[PDB]
């Protein structure tokens, strides 16, 4: 609350990743690390995990406390992309494939 920093610990998927009814994807994550409250590191990269694509819809997502749960809405581009949550080796890398309805 006083100092806003990026979470350094591990996240885990806490619900099936799924499509909304308005062309977006929702991901729920449990924060298992420390230093909370802290900001959830998250971005979407291309099929090569290189360039940043799509965008995050939710306002700056936070992990409020240890073992807290956070809902995140984002907008992957069409085709293959990777939702990367957290930093370092423990980072979650989730393959998403978006088709045209």
């Amino acid at each position, epitope marked *: 609350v006083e100092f806003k920093r990026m979470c350094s610990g591990k996240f885990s998927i*806490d619900k*099936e990743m799924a*499509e909304t009814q308005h062309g977006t994807t929702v991901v729920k994550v449990k924060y298992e690390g420390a230093g909370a409250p802290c900001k959830v590191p998250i971005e979407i990269r291309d099929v090569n995990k290189e360039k940043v694509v799509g965008r995050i819809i939710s306002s700056t997502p936070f992990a409020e406390y240890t073992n807290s749960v956070t809902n995140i809405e984002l907008e992957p581009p069409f085709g293959d992309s990777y939702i990367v949550i957290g930093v370092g080796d423990s980072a979650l890398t*989730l393959h998403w494939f978006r088709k045209h309805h």
Partner: antibody
Amino acid sequence: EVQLQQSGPELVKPGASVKISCKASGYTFTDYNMHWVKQSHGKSLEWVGYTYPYNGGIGYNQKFKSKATLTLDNSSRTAYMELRSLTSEDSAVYYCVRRGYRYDGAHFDYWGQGTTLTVSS
Amino acid sequence: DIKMTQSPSSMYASLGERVTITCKASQGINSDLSWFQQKPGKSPKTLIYRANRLVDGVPSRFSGSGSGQDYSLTISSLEYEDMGIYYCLQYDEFPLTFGAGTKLELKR
């Protein structure tokens, strides 16, 4: 029509392992996750885990993390659940059940016929 | 883990009557809730998902309602084939958890 066909009954000794299959048909396989569920005789249903068709999206109920290994084969539209270090407590009926993660998907609407596992010496 | 509590554990009814059974989550599950019916030695058959979406092919006498922590399944007019055990499932958060079931039996 949607169909989930599981492999037949299994009878093994304690310490052994088994691998139950669940072949799907009648829908776009990659648009659905496959969950596995345990039901001991006379007991409630219990979540084992699930598999998501892309990049080994794997979820384990922490209870089964040292017991089960879930896998997928998208090309054959077949899900597998492998149980190891078996004991009598593993004896139960196991089901596969699908869950659509797309905007137009249905949730847990079709189950497999179930697969009976009996562990004993 | 989210605890799912079904009430009642068992109950009796007569053909033609409305039956309502309930399922309460220990925390809000945002309508990520499904209902199933299961007969002895058979696999579960799904009635409802997303708390109120009727599964294609399932008779219209079954309906689902509720929100937050509380959910109800209602059979408007009980029929003979409706006997069995009904289960609820939350899939809002891992691990998925099931209620202990409600056994529905026939009066006489």
